[PDB]
Amino acid sequence: MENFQKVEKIGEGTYGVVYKARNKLTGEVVALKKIRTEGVPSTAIREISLLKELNHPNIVKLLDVIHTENKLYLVFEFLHQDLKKFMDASALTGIPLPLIKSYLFQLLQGLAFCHSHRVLHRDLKPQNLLINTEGAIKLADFGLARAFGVPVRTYTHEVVTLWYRAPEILLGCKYYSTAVDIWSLGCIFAEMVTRRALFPGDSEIDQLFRIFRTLGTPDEVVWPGVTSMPDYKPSFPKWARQDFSKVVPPLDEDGRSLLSQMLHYDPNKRISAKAALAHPFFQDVTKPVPHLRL
Numbered sequence: 001m002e003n004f005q006k007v008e009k010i011g012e013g014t015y016g017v018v019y020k021a022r023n024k025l026t027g028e029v030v031a032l033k034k035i036r037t038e039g040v041p042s043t044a045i046r047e048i049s050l051l052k053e054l055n056h057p058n059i060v061k062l063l064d065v066i067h068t069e070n071k072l073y074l075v076f077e078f079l080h081q082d083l084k085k086f087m088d089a090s091a092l093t094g095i096p097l098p099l100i101k102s103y104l105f106q107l108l109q110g111l112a113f114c115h116s117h118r119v120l121h122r123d124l125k126p127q128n129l130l131i132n133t134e135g136a137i138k139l140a141d142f143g144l145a146r147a148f149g150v151p152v153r154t155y156t157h158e159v160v161t162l163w164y165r166a167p168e169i170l171l172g173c174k175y176y177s178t179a180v181d182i183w184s185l186g187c188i189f190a191e192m193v194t195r196r197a198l199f200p201g202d203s204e205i206d207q208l209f210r211i212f213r214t215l216g217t218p219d220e221v222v223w224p225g226v227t228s229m230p231d232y233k234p235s236f237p238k239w240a241r242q243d244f245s246k247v248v249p250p251l252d253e254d255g256r257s258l259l260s261q262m263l264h265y266d267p268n269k270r271i272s273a274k275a276a277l278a279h280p281f282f283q284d285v286t287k288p289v290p291h292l293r294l
């Protein structure tokens, strides 16, 4: 692109590298993502284009889609910091509960909007949740996984995180439901509260086994159909479920209650974003302003 001027590289997504750029025209500063391949799929540039209409205050706005020279550039609004960075910065002290509750509340509104438009994220994680000084938090990279498909690593040599991957995906399901996003968000919710990733797997089986060790190895009782899943093995060790009081202390009972419904094994039983918004946990929700040092 000749219009912009790569101010800085603000990260390396799984679908390409993201740059902060100043538009020599509008002068506006935006986030410029260079996607990945012999010319980029055509069904892809059509799916992505549809997301320009998926506008919501809790969804990073996709300003433009430019397919040129068999290269794909996505232009997004720019936010100054991602949640992973804010958590690392807040670890010594921990993000205050009121601000954790506000972010979760906003993320669920974002998901509710996307899910109502039959759009799933599929790859939610702290690194693509963006915050601003006004206390807002927004979902980035929505719909990208759909158009494309998470490969071995990423666009290039660099491991993709599995820490937030729903169990049905790890067990080989072919069709993903909106429930996969709820699972990811529950994982992020727990990480904000405890200041440590909930299920930091370093391999697919390790990821699954970390989930089993904490929530109990799933069976036909809690998850009808699970033993019929593609990657399910009768040889999986049988671990007992641990109490949530031990999983996310010292989170209160409303919080633990909501988290438990967000981490139900059966995707059909997992709480929807719409319903999570009505949970007693958000009875006293407010919108605190974060402390960002840009």
Ligand SMILES: Nc1nc(N)nc(-c2cc(O)ccc2O)n1
Pocket: 010, 011, 018, 031, 033, 060, 076, 077, 078, 079, 080, 081, 082, 127, 130, 140, 141
């Ligand atoms: N890691 C990181 N940091 C910052 N500050 N921003 C972004 C960002 C990522 C996107 O995909 C879109 C817009 C953005 O502002 N990503």
